[PDB]
Amino acid sequence: QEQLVESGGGVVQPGGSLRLSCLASGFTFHKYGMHWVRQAPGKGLEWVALISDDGMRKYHSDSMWGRVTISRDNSKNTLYLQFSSLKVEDTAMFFCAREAGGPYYNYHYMDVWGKGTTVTVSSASTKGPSVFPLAPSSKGGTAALGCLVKDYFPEPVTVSWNSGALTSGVHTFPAVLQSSGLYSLSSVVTVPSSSLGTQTYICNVNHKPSNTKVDKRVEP
Amino acid sequence: ALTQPASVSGSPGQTITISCNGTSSDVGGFDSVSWYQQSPGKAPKVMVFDVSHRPSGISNRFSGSKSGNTASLTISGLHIEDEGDYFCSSLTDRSHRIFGGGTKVTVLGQPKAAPSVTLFPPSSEELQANKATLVCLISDFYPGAVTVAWKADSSPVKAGVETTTPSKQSNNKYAASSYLSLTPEQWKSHKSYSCQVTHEGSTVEKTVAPT
Numbered sequence A: 001q002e003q004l005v006e007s008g009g010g011v012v013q014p015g016g017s018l019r020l021s022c023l024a025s026g027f028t029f030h031k032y033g034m035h036w037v038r039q040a041p042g043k044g045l046e047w048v049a050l051i052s053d054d055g056m057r058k059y060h061s062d063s064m065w066g067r068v069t070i071s072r073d074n075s076k077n078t079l080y081l082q083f084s085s086l087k088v089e090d091t092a093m094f095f096c097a098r099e100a101g102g103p104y105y106n107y108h109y110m111d112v113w114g115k116g117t118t119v120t121v122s123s124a125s126t127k128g129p130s131v132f133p134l135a136p137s138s139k140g141g142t143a144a145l146g147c148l149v150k151d152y153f154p155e156p157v158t159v160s161w162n163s164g165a166l167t168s169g170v171h172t173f174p175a176v177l178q179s180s181g182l183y184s185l186s187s188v189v190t191v192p193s194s195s196l197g198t199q200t201y202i203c204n205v206n207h208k209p210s211n212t213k214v215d216k217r218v219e220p
Numbered sequence B: 001a002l003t004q005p006a007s008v009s010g011s012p013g014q015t016i017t018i019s020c021n022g023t024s025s026d027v028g029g030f031d032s033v034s035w036y037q038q039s040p041g042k043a044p045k046v047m048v049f050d051v052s053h054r055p056s057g058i059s060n061r062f063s064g065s066k067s068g069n070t071a072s073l074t075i076s077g078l079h080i081e082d083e084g085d086y087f088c089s090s091l092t093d094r095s096h097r098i099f100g101g102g103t104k105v106t107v108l109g110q111p112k113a114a115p116s117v118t119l120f121p122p123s124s125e126e127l128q129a130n131k132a133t134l135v136c137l138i139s140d141f142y143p144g145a146v147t148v149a150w151k152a153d154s155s156p157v158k159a160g161v162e163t164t165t166p167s168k169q170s171n172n173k174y175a176a177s178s179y180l181s182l183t184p185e186q187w188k189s190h191k192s193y194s195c196q197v198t199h200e201g202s203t204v205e206k207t208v209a210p211t
């Protein structure tokens, strides 16, 4: 049946170039236009390019600023997307999609999608995190304090509190990819204000990749 | 980008509608509006095309419409299996395609829950390391859809904002986090910095100050 599989993603360096590929099957490739659609992490779908059945006509998004070139090889039943001057803000998943059509006229919607390939653009190797304490502010009833675990690459980093002896009231959030190409994440614990200055709140951060373990006391 | 509501929610069986406000160069200039459903960790799926048409083998409880420059997607008798993100898309004047920003559809299964909001200022340790970051934490809300708007003093702010996608806590409610990246000089320059989370109509706000 009708299928597309994207491949060629992975981690790439800013300023560098890259070529993604979509391999088709289950339908007569050379009869359909093909698009690329991208999706940055947690944002919307976003159109990138369309190429005609015979590959002699290309259309690109004006907001790619000419950095992407779509192409295809109908002998290989394969579609391609090429970059140059990659940027961190290019980080996204990349979906290949078919332009629905028939007696062929293009019908103006995408009826076949691959499970895309992910492109992560970062200039970093294995960066261990900085851990800054989010101290409890002047309140009191309930106190919220935490640890800010930023500037690290790659994912993931794991976080416990008081060496796992503290578990109730812990919200460890998912990681954001910053403008820099590095990740930040946060962990808060909700504790009684009365326990400040008598309990000790330390957060234990392990970044397996850069083999960095760190404990930070969070105090008022 | 065509404009969709960040979030629309309905209970099972109920009938719900997602709007797609465009311009006369796209939605209004053609009859080539399609809608895609993307479920958690999947590749999008065509639901509607040419405004109101449904592909072979797609539930009749999905229907599309258009008035002027806005299209609509209607889902009558919501099922749980419908939850996901939905995008409108249109042909344009320049023979390009364009998508809407998307709408998270939730099928309510528990009572509404307002988000608890906490906002931390830059730590001292970060400022000395010549950096600054406001961290706005959000938890305990249902449905799991929030809009996070930042403001320096009274005026809006879009540069340096990074917001996560809500995830399910162990209490089956949702949490998200939002970071505003500053320079030590920007932080010090302003009087305050509010972080406003809007959830199902209501808006909780928290505020922090330099000294």
Ligand SMILES: *[C@@H]1O[C@H](CO)[C@@H](O)[C@H](O)[C@H]1NC(C)=O
Binding pocket: B021, B022, B067, B068, B069, B070
């Ligand atoms: C989209 O809706 C807004 C009002 O909510 C309006 O400004 C705009 O004209 C609408 N588009 C049309 C023509 O339906």
